[PDB]
Short mmCIF file of C-alpha atoms and ligand atoms in Angstrom, two decimals:
data_model
loop_
_atom_site.label_atom_id
_atom_site.label_comp_id
_atom_site.label_asym_id
_atom_site.label_seq_id
_atom_site.Cartn_x
_atom_site.Cartn_y
_atom_site.Cartn_z
CA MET A 1 13.59 -2.24 19.72
CA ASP A 2 10.30 -4.11 19.64
CA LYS A 3 10.08 -7.87 18.98
CA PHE A 4 7.31 -10.45 18.45
CA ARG A 5 7.45 -13.65 20.52
CA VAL A 6 5.27 -16.38 19.00
CA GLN A 7 4.41 -19.76 20.53
CA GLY A 8 3.57 -22.40 17.94
CA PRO A 9 1.84 -24.24 16.49
CA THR A 10 -1.61 -22.64 16.53
CA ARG A 11 -4.48 -22.86 14.08
CA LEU A 12 -5.47 -19.37 12.88
CA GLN A 13 -9.23 -19.17 12.78
CA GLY A 14 -12.15 -16.87 13.33
CA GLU A 15 -12.61 -13.29 12.26
CA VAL A 16 -10.48 -10.30 11.25
CA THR A 17 -11.57 -6.82 10.29
CA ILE A 18 -9.55 -5.43 7.37
CA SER A 19 -8.00 -1.96 7.83
CA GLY A 20 -8.17 0.77 5.18
CA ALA A 21 -5.36 0.92 2.61
CA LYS A 22 -2.51 3.25 3.54
CA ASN A 23 -1.80 3.44 -0.17
CA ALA A 24 -5.22 4.77 -1.05
CA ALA A 25 -5.44 6.88 2.13
CA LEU A 26 -2.20 8.84 1.40
CA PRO A 27 -3.10 10.13 -2.08
CA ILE A 28 -6.67 10.90 -0.92
CA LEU A 29 -5.32 12.85 2.07
CA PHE A 30 -3.24 14.99 -0.34
CA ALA A 31 -6.05 15.36 -2.81
CA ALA A 32 -8.15 16.82 0.03
CA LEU A 33 -6.05 19.96 -0.40
CA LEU A 34 -8.32 20.51 -3.40
CA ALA A 35 -11.46 20.60 -1.20
CA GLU A 36 -13.14 23.98 -0.61
CA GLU A 37 -15.53 22.61 2.01
CA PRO A 38 -14.86 20.26 4.93
CA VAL A 39 -14.18 16.60 4.19
CA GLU A 40 -14.45 13.43 6.25
CA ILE A 41 -12.13 10.64 5.15
CA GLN A 42 -13.31 7.43 6.79
CA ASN A 43 -11.57 4.11 7.32
CA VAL A 44 -8.02 5.58 7.56
CA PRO A 45 -5.55 3.26 9.34
CA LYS A 46 -3.43 4.43 12.26
CA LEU A 47 0.04 4.39 10.71
CA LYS A 48 3.20 6.52 10.84
CA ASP A 49 2.82 7.92 7.28
CA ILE A 50 -0.69 9.05 8.12
CA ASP A 51 0.74 11.09 10.99
CA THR A 52 3.49 12.62 8.90
CA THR A 53 0.83 13.53 6.36
CA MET A 54 -1.33 14.99 9.12
CA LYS A 55 1.59 17.16 10.33
CA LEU A 56 2.41 18.14 6.77
CA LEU A 57 -1.19 19.25 6.13
CA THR A 58 -1.47 21.25 9.34
CA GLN A 59 1.77 22.99 8.39
CA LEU A 60 0.11 24.17 5.19
CA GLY A 61 -2.60 25.89 7.19
CA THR A 62 -5.10 23.04 6.96
CA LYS A 63 -7.40 22.19 9.85
CA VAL A 64 -6.80 18.53 10.77
CA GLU A 65 -8.16 16.08 13.34
CA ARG A 66 -8.56 12.32 13.70
CA UNK A 67 -9.92 9.46 15.80
CA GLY A 68 -11.53 5.96 12.74
CA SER A 69 -11.81 8.88 10.40
CA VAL A 70 -9.66 11.86 9.61
CA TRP A 71 -11.42 15.20 9.45
CA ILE A 72 -10.06 17.71 6.95
CA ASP A 73 -10.86 21.38 6.46
CA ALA A 74 -8.72 22.92 3.72
CA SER A 75 -10.68 26.15 3.45
CA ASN A 76 -7.80 28.16 4.85
CA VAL A 77 -4.51 26.94 3.40
CA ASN A 78 -2.11 29.90 3.76
CA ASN A 79 1.34 28.30 3.60
CA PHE A 80 2.61 26.78 0.32
CA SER A 81 5.80 25.01 1.38
CA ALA A 82 6.54 21.38 2.35
CA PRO A 83 9.77 21.98 4.34
CA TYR A 84 12.72 19.58 4.23
CA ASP A 85 11.65 18.75 7.75
CA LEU A 86 8.64 16.72 6.49
CA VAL A 87 9.42 15.18 3.10
CA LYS A 88 12.14 13.48 5.16
CA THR A 89 11.12 9.88 5.61
CA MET A 90 8.07 10.26 3.35
CA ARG A 91 8.15 9.90 -0.42
CA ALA A 92 4.39 10.53 -0.54
CA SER A 93 5.22 14.16 0.39
CA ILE A 94 5.54 14.89 -3.31
CA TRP A 95 1.73 14.53 -3.59
CA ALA A 96 1.27 17.98 -2.05
CA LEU A 97 2.78 19.67 -5.12
CA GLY A 98 -0.01 19.25 -7.68
CA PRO A 99 -3.06 20.23 -5.54
CA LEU A 100 -1.13 23.25 -4.32
CA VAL A 101 -0.33 24.73 -7.71
CA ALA A 102 -3.62 23.52 -9.20
CA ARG A 103 -5.71 25.14 -6.48
CA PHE A 104 -3.46 27.95 -5.24
CA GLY A 105 -1.24 28.73 -8.23
CA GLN A 106 1.91 27.95 -6.31
CA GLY A 107 3.56 25.13 -4.43
CA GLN A 108 7.00 24.20 -3.19
CA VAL A 109 8.28 20.87 -1.97
CA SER A 110 11.61 19.85 -0.51
CA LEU A 111 13.77 17.24 -2.27
CA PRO A 112 16.34 14.95 -0.60
CA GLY A 113 19.92 15.25 -1.91
CA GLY A 114 21.12 13.54 -5.08
CA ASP A 115 22.24 10.48 -3.05
CA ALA A 116 20.99 10.59 0.59
CA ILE A 117 18.85 7.47 1.32
CA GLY A 118 16.20 8.50 -1.21
CA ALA A 119 17.76 9.58 -4.52
CA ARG A 120 14.47 8.32 -5.95
CA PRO A 121 13.56 10.51 -8.98
CA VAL A 122 10.28 12.40 -9.06
CA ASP A 123 10.83 13.48 -12.66
CA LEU A 124 7.49 12.12 -13.82
CA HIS A 125 5.59 14.27 -11.34
CA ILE A 126 7.51 17.35 -12.37
CA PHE A 127 7.22 16.80 -16.08
CA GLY A 128 3.54 15.94 -15.75
CA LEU A 129 2.90 19.27 -14.05
CA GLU A 130 4.99 21.19 -16.62
CA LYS A 131 2.80 19.46 -19.25
CA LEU A 132 -0.27 20.93 -17.52
CA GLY A 133 1.20 24.43 -17.92
CA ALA A 134 2.91 24.80 -14.57
CA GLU A 135 6.11 26.79 -14.58
CA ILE A 136 8.78 24.75 -12.83
CA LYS A 137 11.81 25.99 -10.90
CA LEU A 138 14.54 23.61 -9.80
CA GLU A 139 17.55 24.52 -7.74
CA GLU A 140 18.56 21.14 -6.27
CA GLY A 141 16.96 20.07 -3.02
CA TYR A 142 13.81 22.03 -3.78
CA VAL A 143 11.17 22.01 -6.48
CA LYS A 144 8.81 24.87 -7.22
CA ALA A 145 5.72 24.81 -9.43
CA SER A 146 3.61 27.83 -10.17
CA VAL A 147 0.97 29.03 -12.56
CA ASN A 148 -0.74 32.31 -13.34
CA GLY A 149 -4.43 31.42 -13.19
CA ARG A 150 -5.55 27.90 -14.12
CA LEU A 151 -3.62 24.85 -15.26
CA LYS A 152 -4.40 23.69 -18.83
CA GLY A 153 -5.58 20.20 -19.73
CA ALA A 154 -3.14 18.27 -21.88
CA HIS A 155 -2.74 15.00 -23.74
CA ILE A 156 -0.06 13.28 -21.68
CA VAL A 157 1.62 10.08 -22.79
CA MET A 158 3.48 8.22 -20.04
CA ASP A 159 6.65 6.50 -21.01
CA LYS A 160 6.83 4.69 -17.66
CA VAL A 161 3.81 3.41 -15.71
CA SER A 162 3.80 5.27 -12.39
CA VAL A 163 1.31 5.06 -9.54
CA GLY A 164 2.85 8.19 -8.06
CA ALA A 165 2.82 10.40 -11.16
CA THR A 166 -0.63 9.20 -12.23
CA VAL A 167 -1.95 10.51 -8.90
CA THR A 168 -0.13 13.83 -9.31
CA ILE A 169 -1.29 14.43 -12.89
CA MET A 170 -4.87 13.21 -12.29
CA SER A 171 -5.27 15.28 -9.09
CA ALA A 172 -3.92 18.48 -10.62
CA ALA A 173 -5.98 17.92 -13.79
CA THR A 174 -9.33 18.16 -11.99
CA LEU A 175 -8.98 21.96 -11.60
CA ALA A 176 -7.43 22.62 -14.96
CA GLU A 177 -9.17 24.22 -17.93
CA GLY A 178 -10.03 21.58 -20.49
CA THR A 179 -9.56 17.87 -20.80
CA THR A 180 -6.47 15.92 -19.73
CA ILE A 181 -5.81 12.46 -21.06
CA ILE A 182 -3.32 10.26 -19.27
CA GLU A 183 -2.04 7.43 -21.52
CA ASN A 184 -0.37 4.45 -19.83
CA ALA A 185 -1.94 5.36 -16.45
CA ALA A 186 -1.26 3.13 -13.46
CA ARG A 187 -4.10 0.60 -13.00
CA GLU A 188 -3.93 0.06 -9.21
CA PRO A 189 -7.13 -0.29 -7.15
CA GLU A 190 -5.61 2.65 -5.18
CA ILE A 191 -5.68 4.80 -8.33
CA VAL A 192 -9.39 3.88 -8.76
CA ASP A 193 -10.13 4.83 -5.16
CA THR A 194 -8.37 8.19 -5.52
CA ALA A 195 -10.22 8.90 -8.74
CA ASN A 196 -13.54 8.02 -7.05
CA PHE A 197 -12.81 10.31 -4.12
CA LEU A 198 -12.12 13.09 -6.63
CA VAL A 199 -15.42 12.41 -8.35
CA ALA A 200 -17.21 12.48 -4.99
CA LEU A 201 -15.93 16.07 -4.66
CA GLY A 202 -17.37 17.06 -8.05
CA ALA A 203 -14.51 16.18 -10.43
CA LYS A 204 -15.10 14.73 -13.90
CA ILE A 205 -12.96 11.61 -14.35
CA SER A 206 -13.37 8.45 -16.42
CA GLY A 207 -11.24 5.46 -17.34
CA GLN A 208 -9.86 4.91 -13.85
CA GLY A 209 -8.57 1.36 -13.64
CA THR A 210 -7.76 1.19 -17.36
CA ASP A 211 -4.68 2.18 -19.41
CA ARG A 212 -6.35 5.48 -20.14
CA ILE A 213 -7.61 8.17 -17.71
CA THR A 214 -9.56 11.15 -18.99
CA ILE A 215 -10.24 14.21 -16.82
CA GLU A 216 -12.43 17.22 -17.64
CA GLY A 217 -11.50 20.16 -15.45
CA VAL A 218 -13.96 22.00 -13.21
CA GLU A 219 -13.59 25.31 -11.41
CA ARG A 220 -13.79 23.88 -7.90
CA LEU A 221 -14.18 20.83 -5.67
CA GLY A 222 -16.54 20.76 -2.68
CA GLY A 223 -16.52 18.63 0.46
CA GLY A 224 -18.27 15.51 1.66
CA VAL A 225 -17.67 12.08 3.13
CA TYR A 226 -15.48 9.41 1.52
CA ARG A 227 -14.57 5.93 2.73
CA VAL A 228 -11.05 4.68 1.98
CA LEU A 229 -10.92 1.29 0.31
CA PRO A 230 -9.94 -1.97 2.04
CA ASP A 231 -6.29 -2.98 2.21
CA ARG A 232 -5.91 -5.72 -0.44
CA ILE A 233 -2.51 -6.99 0.72
CA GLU A 234 -3.56 -7.07 4.40
CA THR A 235 -6.62 -9.09 3.36
CA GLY A 236 -4.36 -11.42 1.42
CA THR A 237 -2.00 -11.77 4.35
CA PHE A 238 -4.89 -12.91 6.56
CA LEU A 239 -6.34 -15.27 3.99
CA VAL A 240 -2.91 -16.91 3.85
CA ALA A 241 -2.64 -17.18 7.64
CA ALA A 242 -5.79 -19.28 7.43
CA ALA A 243 -4.72 -21.28 4.39
CA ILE A 244 -1.44 -22.34 5.94
CA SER A 245 -2.95 -23.29 9.30
CA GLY A 246 -5.85 -25.49 8.18
CA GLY A 247 -8.08 -22.79 9.53
CA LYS A 248 -11.30 -21.07 8.65
CA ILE A 249 -11.47 -17.28 8.52
CA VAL A 250 -13.85 -14.57 7.43
CA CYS A 251 -12.39 -11.19 6.37
CA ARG A 252 -14.70 -8.30 7.27
CA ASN A 253 -14.62 -4.87 5.60
CA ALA A 254 -13.07 -6.52 2.54
CA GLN A 255 -13.28 -5.77 -1.20
CA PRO A 256 -13.32 -9.08 -3.17
CA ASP A 257 -12.92 -7.47 -6.61
CA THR A 258 -9.45 -6.07 -5.82
CA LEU A 259 -8.17 -9.63 -5.19
CA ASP A 260 -9.20 -11.82 -8.13
CA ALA A 261 -5.79 -13.34 -8.82
CA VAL A 262 -5.01 -13.96 -5.17
CA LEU A 263 -8.41 -15.72 -4.73
CA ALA A 264 -7.95 -17.96 -7.76
CA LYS A 265 -4.44 -18.70 -6.49
CA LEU A 266 -5.87 -19.64 -3.07
CA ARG A 267 -8.37 -21.96 -4.76
CA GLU A 268 -5.50 -23.69 -6.59
CA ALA A 269 -3.99 -24.34 -3.14
CA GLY A 270 -7.11 -26.30 -2.25
CA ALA A 271 -8.89 -23.58 -0.29
CA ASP A 272 -12.70 -23.33 -0.01
CA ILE A 273 -13.70 -19.76 -0.74
CA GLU A 274 -16.89 -17.71 -0.73
CA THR A 275 -17.39 -13.98 -1.16
CA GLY A 276 -20.06 -11.42 -0.52
CA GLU A 277 -20.35 -7.70 -1.15
CA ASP A 278 -17.99 -6.82 1.70
CA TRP A 279 -16.43 -10.04 2.89
CA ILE A 280 -14.36 -13.07 1.98
CA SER A 281 -14.44 -16.51 3.61
CA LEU A 282 -11.64 -19.04 3.44
CA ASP A 283 -11.89 -22.65 4.68
CA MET A 284 -9.08 -25.22 4.67
CA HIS A 285 -11.22 -27.95 6.27
CA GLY A 286 -8.27 -29.03 8.43
CA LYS A 287 -6.36 -29.62 5.21
CA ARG A 288 -2.72 -28.80 4.46
CA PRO A 289 -2.33 -26.50 1.42
CA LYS A 290 -1.51 -27.83 -2.07
CA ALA A 291 1.68 -26.47 -3.63
CA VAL A 292 0.96 -23.74 -6.28
CA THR A 293 2.75 -22.10 -9.21
CA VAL A 294 3.00 -18.30 -9.03
CA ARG A 295 3.97 -15.57 -11.53
CA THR A 296 3.90 -12.02 -10.24
CA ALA A 297 2.93 -9.37 -12.75
CA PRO A 298 1.23 -5.91 -13.12
CA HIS A 299 -2.26 -5.42 -11.66
CA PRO A 300 -4.80 -7.00 -12.18
CA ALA A 301 -2.56 -10.08 -12.32
CA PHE A 302 -0.89 -11.67 -9.26
CA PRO A 303 0.59 -8.86 -7.01
CA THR A 304 4.28 -8.98 -6.23
CA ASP A 305 3.20 -7.74 -2.75
CA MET A 306 1.72 -11.15 -1.92
CA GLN A 307 4.87 -12.94 -2.93
CA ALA A 308 6.54 -13.58 0.42
CA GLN A 309 3.21 -14.82 1.73
CA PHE A 310 2.71 -17.35 -1.08
CA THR A 311 6.32 -18.42 -0.77
CA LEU A 312 5.54 -19.31 2.86
CA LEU A 313 2.37 -21.14 1.75
CA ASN A 314 4.36 -23.32 -0.70
CA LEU A 315 6.96 -24.00 1.97
CA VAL A 316 4.44 -25.81 4.17
CA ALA A 317 2.38 -27.28 1.35
CA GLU A 318 2.05 -30.74 -0.11
CA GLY A 319 4.50 -30.92 -3.01
CA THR A 320 6.69 -28.59 -5.03
CA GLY A 321 5.78 -25.10 -6.24
CA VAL A 322 7.79 -22.37 -7.96
CA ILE A 323 7.38 -18.63 -7.50
CA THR A 324 8.62 -16.43 -10.35
CA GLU A 325 9.12 -12.63 -10.13
CA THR A 326 8.57 -11.45 -13.72
CA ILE A 327 9.25 -7.77 -12.94
CA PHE A 328 11.24 -7.38 -9.68
CA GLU A 329 14.84 -8.34 -8.75
CA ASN A 330 16.23 -9.40 -5.38
CA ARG A 331 12.85 -10.18 -3.92
CA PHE A 332 13.81 -13.36 -2.10
CA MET A 333 16.26 -12.07 0.51
CA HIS A 334 14.12 -13.40 3.35
CA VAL A 335 14.13 -17.08 2.25
CA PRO A 336 17.28 -18.01 4.20
CA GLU A 337 15.37 -17.03 7.37
CA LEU A 338 12.71 -19.54 6.42
CA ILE A 339 15.33 -22.20 5.75
CA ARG A 340 16.54 -21.68 9.33
CA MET A 341 13.02 -22.69 10.36
CA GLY A 342 13.25 -25.97 8.47
CA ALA A 343 12.00 -25.01 5.01
CA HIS A 344 13.28 -26.56 1.79
CA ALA A 345 14.02 -24.07 -0.97
CA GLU A 346 16.30 -23.21 -3.90
CA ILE A 347 16.68 -19.68 -5.20
CA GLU A 348 17.37 -19.60 -8.91
CA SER A 349 17.39 -16.51 -11.10
CA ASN A 350 14.08 -14.62 -10.67
CA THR A 351 12.57 -17.67 -8.93
CA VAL A 352 12.29 -19.63 -5.70
CA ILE A 353 11.77 -23.40 -5.92
CA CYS A 354 9.62 -24.54 -2.98
CA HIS A 355 9.65 -28.07 -1.57
CA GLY A 356 6.88 -28.15 1.02
CA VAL A 357 7.51 -29.74 4.42
CA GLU A 358 5.14 -30.92 7.12
CA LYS A 359 5.99 -28.56 9.92
CA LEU A 360 8.33 -25.63 10.61
CA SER A 361 10.57 -25.24 13.65
CA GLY A 362 10.67 -22.01 15.70
CA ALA A 363 13.75 -19.81 15.69
CA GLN A 364 15.12 -16.28 15.91
CA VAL A 365 14.30 -14.46 12.69
CA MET A 366 14.41 -11.07 10.99
CA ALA A 367 13.55 -9.47 7.64
CA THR A 368 13.55 -5.80 6.70
CA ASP A 369 10.83 -5.99 4.07
CA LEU A 370 7.28 -5.25 5.26
CA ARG A 371 5.69 -8.28 3.58
CA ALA A 372 8.51 -10.72 4.24
CA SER A 373 8.63 -9.71 7.89
CA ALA A 374 4.91 -10.20 8.32
CA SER A 375 5.35 -13.60 6.68
CA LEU A 376 7.93 -14.56 9.34
CA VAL A 377 5.30 -13.92 12.00
CA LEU A 378 2.85 -16.13 10.11
CA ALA A 379 5.49 -18.85 10.06
CA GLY A 380 6.02 -18.32 13.77
CA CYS A 381 2.36 -19.11 14.29
CA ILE A 382 2.57 -22.52 12.56
CA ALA A 383 6.10 -23.50 13.48
CA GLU A 384 6.75 -25.86 16.38
CA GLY A 385 7.95 -24.09 19.50
CA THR A 386 9.10 -20.52 20.02
CA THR A 387 9.83 -18.03 17.28
CA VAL A 388 11.16 -14.53 17.88
CA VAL A 389 10.66 -12.07 15.03
CA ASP A 390 13.02 -9.16 15.37
CA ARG A 391 12.78 -5.51 14.39
CA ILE A 392 9.07 -5.58 13.86
CA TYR A 393 8.82 -1.82 13.47
CA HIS A 394 8.90 -2.52 9.71
CA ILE A 395 5.61 -4.34 10.10
CA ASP A 396 4.00 -1.57 12.21
CA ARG A 397 4.65 0.75 9.25
CA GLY A 398 2.05 -0.93 7.07
CA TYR A 399 0.11 -3.13 9.49
CA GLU A 400 -2.41 -1.79 11.97
CA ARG A 401 -1.83 -3.65 15.28
CA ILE A 402 -1.22 -7.03 13.67
CA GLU A 403 -0.45 -8.77 16.95
CA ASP A 404 -4.01 -8.02 18.11
CA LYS A 405 -5.55 -9.38 14.91
CA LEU A 406 -3.53 -12.54 15.01
CA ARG A 407 -4.30 -12.99 18.69
CA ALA A 408 -8.05 -12.76 18.07
CA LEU A 409 -7.48 -15.55 15.52
CA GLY A 410 -5.86 -17.86 18.07
CA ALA A 411 -2.20 -16.92 17.87
CA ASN A 412 0.01 -17.12 20.96
CA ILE A 413 1.79 -13.83 20.33
CA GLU A 414 3.56 -11.28 22.50
CA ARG A 415 4.94 -7.79 21.83
CA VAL A 416 8.24 -7.65 23.72
CA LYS A 417 9.53 -4.10 24.33
CA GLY A 418 13.03 -2.81 25.06
CA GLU A 419 14.85 -6.10 24.41
O1 UPG B 1 8.80 10.54 -10.86
C1 UPG B 1 8.98 9.35 -10.96
C2 UPG B 1 8.06 8.44 -10.34
C3 UPG B 1 8.29 7.11 -10.48
N1 UPG B 1 9.39 6.65 -11.21
C4 UPG B 1 9.61 5.20 -11.34
O2 UPG B 1 8.38 4.51 -11.67
C5 UPG B 1 8.38 3.20 -11.05
C6 UPG B 1 6.99 2.92 -10.42
O3 UPG B 1 6.31 4.17 -10.06
P1 UPG B 1 5.23 3.99 -8.81
O4 UPG B 1 4.46 2.93 -9.77
O5 UPG B 1 5.14 5.45 -8.97
O6 UPG B 1 6.48 3.43 -7.95
P2 UPG B 1 6.48 4.17 -6.51
O7 UPG B 1 5.21 3.86 -5.78
O8 UPG B 1 6.64 5.77 -6.72
O9 UPG B 1 7.77 3.64 -5.67
C7 UPG B 1 7.36 2.64 -4.70
O10 UPG B 1 7.59 1.29 -5.23
C8 UPG B 1 9.02 1.03 -5.48
C9 UPG B 1 9.19 -0.39 -6.05
O11 UPG B 1 8.44 -0.52 -7.26
C10 UPG B 1 9.84 1.18 -4.16
O12 UPG B 1 11.24 0.92 -4.41
C11 UPG B 1 9.65 2.63 -3.62
O13 UPG B 1 10.39 2.82 -2.41
C12 UPG B 1 8.14 2.87 -3.38
O14 UPG B 1 7.91 4.20 -2.88
C13 UPG B 1 9.47 3.19 -9.96
O15 UPG B 1 10.47 2.19 -10.22
C14 UPG B 1 10.09 4.61 -9.99
O16 UPG B 1 11.52 4.63 -9.87
C15 UPG B 1 10.26 7.54 -11.81
O17 UPG B 1 11.22 7.16 -12.45
N2 UPG B 1 10.04 8.88 -11.68
#
C-alpha cells in the first residue's frame, strides 16, 4: 500500500514535461484496430489502462509493442472476442466493439453483471451501432454486434452527450457506406484528437469539436504515425502547483488551446502567463494567489476535472472564493481532509465557500478521487511540516510518475512502500 511522504513548505518551480492524455490514447488505441498497415502511436503515457488495452489488443490477434510510443500492427486480427477477463476493471473495453464489427463484420464484448461494481450502461454504444446497421445480440453479460458486409451511414441524433458513444459511433462510421451525422456529439479535445488520428489514416471526418460530427465512409484505413495530444488536466495540475507556491513554471509538450478557461481562471488569480505553440509559462512573482470564483461546465468552459485543484488554490489565497459545480453532485468529499490541514471552508449545496488562509499544516490525508488525491499532494508541498498522503495508487492510475515531476520542481517528496 504505497504512500507519499511530503516535507513542506517548498516553492514549486522550474520545468515539467506534460505526458500524453490517457483519455485520448485509449480511444486511439482501439481505433487502431481499423488500421490495415502498421501504426505508431507516439506520446502514450505509461499507465495501467494502457497495459490492459495492450493485453486486450494482443488477445485479438494484434501485434503489440511499446517503449515512449506504442507500436501497433492490426493486419492479422483473428480473434473477435473481448473476454470477461479483460473488460474487468476497464470501461474503455467497450471501444473494441465498433472497429471490430466495422472492419471484420463481427465483434463480441463482455459486460459486467447488472449490479457488480460497474452497472454503468453502455446503451448508447449499442444503439449507435444498431443505427449503423449492425445486428445486435444481447444475452446479459455479453454483447454481440455483427453485420453482413459494410455498415451503413446514418443520421444519428444523440439524446445524451456521451464522450464514449461519440467515439464508438464515429470510429465505426469511418468504414461504413455513406455519410454518418452525429448530432449532439461530445466536444472534448480528446474527441478532436481521435477524429484527427482517424483522418491521418485516411478517414473523412469534419465537425470534430463542434455539436455536429459528419463522417463519409471509406473502404479502408492505412497506417502511419500519430502523436497523442497533451494531457490538459495534468498541465492544469502543474500550473496550479506553481500558482499556489509563488513559483514560476514552464509546461513543456503542452497544448494551450485545450485550456482556455483554466488559463483565464489562472490570470484572475493574479498569475502571469505566456504561451507558445507547445508550451505554457506561469509566474506568481513570489505572490500569494488571489481568490477566484469558479463555475464548472461542459467543455470548452471550465472543466470539472480541475475543480479540486482550484478549490485548493482558493484555500490558500487572499480572500474568499466560491466554487460551484453546475453539473456534478457530491464532488467535494475531499474538503474535510483539507480542513484537517487548516483550511477554512463551508460546503453548501453544489458549492464550496473558500476562505483563504496564509499557510496549511501537514497531516495524514487520503482521498479516493484521482484529482482530489493529487490535490492533497500539492497541499502537502505547501503545508508546514510533514504530510502523508495515503493510498496513492489512485493517483498512479492517471498520473505518470508524479513524484518525479514534483521532485524536479523542488518538492521534498518520498514514495513509501509497504507501510
Ligand atoms: O452508453 C452509455 C454511455 C454513456 N452514458 C452516460 O453518459 C454520461 C457521459 O458519457 P461519457 O461523456 O460517455 O461519460 P463516460 O466517460 O462514459 O463515464 C466517465 O465519466 C463518468 C462521470 O461523468 C464516471 O462516473 C465514469 O466512471 C467514467 O468512465 C455518463 O453519465 C453515462 O452514464 C450512458 O447512459 N450510456
